[PDB]
Design a protein around this ligand. Structure first.
Ligand code: 664
Ligand code: 664
Ligand code: ZN
Ligand code: ZN
Lengths: 290, 290
């Protein structure tokens, strides 16, 4: 039940409503063209019917509050919002190569160089957020979008929470992150390390080709995480592996900080492409010498 | 996309498909008439599209396994099942007065006598299950259906689990019970007392007119439960109250068993109607003397 055009009565531009893209939570998502400067965006579009409750409403505002304060190369750009009466409309930078999720569906395990390339940009983006006292809290392959030059842009700040003062332990998380950290489940109080944990699972998943804790039942998975029950295939390199081990530790005070991450030998003693062939979208890159 | 008639190719009868009633999980639910003996039932009807995964499938079988083994006056009667290719069809005893939930929406707090009356039948039904090594695991006002003489019948065994051997602690619960017990949340291993806990919340809710741990956010509620944070209004009688206190204790080894429940002075020193006026559906009963 969503209008063909979208008008921003305050910044004044309107948007022709493009094709479906994806959806997540009470949100569905489409591309959309500025219709005058003709420029192209992704528009996240939430029905106010799903938002009848004040608790849902706040969650949604909070996300705009957090996301809108953010500018940086590996974060999905926030270009504004507005609402009618049935809908909230948010304008985002458009990522034309979808998300890491889709790339994974299609390449399963990646080559090491690809892992570094992508992983590095994931960390740079997370270095950004952490330095602004923001925790994403649901870093996963489907929130890591890729623009046209296959650059990573972090997305969906709907579980993103703001750190309000040094030492704060966020005591609850209203939602179900994919790669959820141990300390969240042991309902124990959590902070930035949850993102290091998630990145730990991303790394596994990209190198190993599957999630570090997958099982047919969610609650069993949660069990696994809590007891820290995973294993790293023997073919994964020993340097790669141990960075995983670093981040996938049940005690957050032991996991690397986002900032010392890029230093790890995985990165510094390894080859990191400068860019990627769009081929790499479907064919393992060989990185030959000419 | 559900057939007008329903045929059981093995017990041979077919069912004319009546009016909507309710829904819960992947299930929607209708009344249905035997079409020959013309008798009336509620039919729970699950699309096999929601059941593509083996884990969902098992959950559903388990429920049929548990529920079908059950016969007793305060349990929703199991009258059979069968499937086509798009649907699972289950035939249930029809409860023409909906559930305690609806009665609560309309009367908020109940008179003590009503509470006993209903509560007693809840316990008798639960005494039954517990003696058959079955835990319902999601006793709540909307699973407590009422037939025509306003008798309680327990329903929905889709989180019901079977106890397989003395001492067993069920380690996980794949779902989100309403009135969920502390030990479930502290991911700690649980058994029959979870139902005593739930009944504890039912009692509160029926007497006090609202749930013992309600808050605008679910995760805050869970916090409350874990820390056992509730309070009993001062107008609730002292005998009533303390039965609540008994059942709403964080340590399951302290909560009354289902079997010693009916002994509690709440019941034995109190007036318990033999039946209820259907008036009581919308008007507080006075229980005069003629
Ligand atoms: C799991 N997958 C994640 C990525 N998917 C996707 C498919 C086609 C797309 O446009 C194209 F073709 F140009 F590349 C895009 N591109 C895109 N660009 C900016 C924001 C969002 C977005 C932000 C959000 C969502 N989306 C799709 C959905 C949920 N909430 C969001 O925050 N998506 C993404 C499909 C689903
Ligand atoms: C929260 N409410 C619970 C009770 N509700 C309800 C409304 C109208 C009804 O028929 C009438 F009019 F004759 F009284 C009934 N009667 C009824 N009788 C047997 C089984 C089920 C049932 C079993 C199950 C469900 N139902 C409605 C839904 C979810 N899963 C079940 O196991 N429901 C129930 C409405 C929703
Ligand atoms: Zn499960
Ligand atoms: Zn919440």
């Amino acid at each position: 039940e969503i209008p063909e055009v979208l008008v921003d009565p305050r910044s004044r531009r309107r948007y022709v409503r493009g094709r479906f893209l994806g959806k997540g939570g009470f949100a569905k998502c489409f591309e959309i063209s500025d219709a005058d400067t003709k420029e192209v965006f992704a528009g996240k579009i939430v029905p106010k019917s799903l938002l009848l409750k004040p608790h849902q409403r706040e969650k949604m505002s909070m996300e705009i509050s957090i996301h809108r304060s953010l500018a940086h190369q590996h974060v999905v750009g926030f270009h504004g919002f507005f609402e009618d009466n049935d809908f909230v409309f948010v304008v985002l930078e458009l990522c034309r190569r979808r998300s890491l999720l889709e790339l994974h569906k299609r390449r399963k395990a990646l080559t090491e160089p690809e892992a570094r390339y992508y992983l590095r940009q994931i960390v740079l983006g997370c270095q950004y957020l952490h330095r602004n006292r923001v925790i994403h809290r649901d870093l996963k392959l489907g929130n890591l979008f890729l623009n046209e030059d296959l650059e990573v842009k972090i997305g969906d700040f709907g579980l993103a929470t703001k750190v309000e003062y040094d030492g704060e332990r966020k005591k609850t998380l209203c939602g179900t992150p994919n790669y959820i950290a141990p300390e969240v489940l042991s309902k124990k109080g959590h902070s930035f390390e949850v993102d290091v944990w998630s990145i730990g699972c991303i790394m596994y998943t990209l190198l190993v080709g599957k999630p570090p804790f997958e099982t047919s039942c969610l609650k069993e998975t949660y069990l696994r995480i809590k007891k820290n029950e995973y294993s790293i295939p023997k073919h994964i390199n020993p340097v790669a592996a141990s960075l995983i081990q670093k981040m996938l530790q049940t005690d957050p005070t032991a996991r690397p900080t986002i900032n010392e991450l890029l230093n790890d030998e995985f990165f510094t003693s390894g080859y990191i492409p400068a860019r990627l062939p769009i081929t790499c979208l479907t064919i393992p890159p060989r990185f030959s010498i000419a």
